[PDB]
Amino acid sequence: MQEQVSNVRARIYKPAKSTMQSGHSKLKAWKLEFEPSCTQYTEPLMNWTGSHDTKQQVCLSFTTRELAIAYAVAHKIDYTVLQDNPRTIVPKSYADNFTKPRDM
């Protein structure tokens, strides 16, 4: 009882909460991954010496969310934001007080 749609979607993921300025020499915090459309292209040209290059999966890497969402918004694409950790709810507490009369 579902409906078929012919459109792509954007997958945005946020980094993990950690102390910044903890020694970094790169620019990558947010991740982006859009679904396939048609006539996909081949991965970009990459090569390294110190460490063997990995095979990309058409995945994109952004630094600021403004850059990520900007991509989807460019074509009004449905972008989803994923958190690194779950969202816990505050501890449900409750106070209690009583009072009695003052007999002579």
The CA-based angle 82-79-28, given to 5 degrees, is 60
DSSP conformational letter for 47: -
**H-run or E-run covering 68:** helix 65-74
Q: Chain centroid to CA 83: how far?
A: 5
Token look-up 């074509």 returns 75
Determination technique for this entry: NMR
- CATH fourth-level superfamily of 8-82: atu1810 like domain (3.30.160.190)
Residue 10: how many other CB atoms lie within 10 Å: 21
Q: How far apart are CA 31 and CA 59, in angstroms?
A: 8
**Do residues 80 and 12 lie in contact, with contact meaning Cβ atoms separated by under 8 Å?**
yes
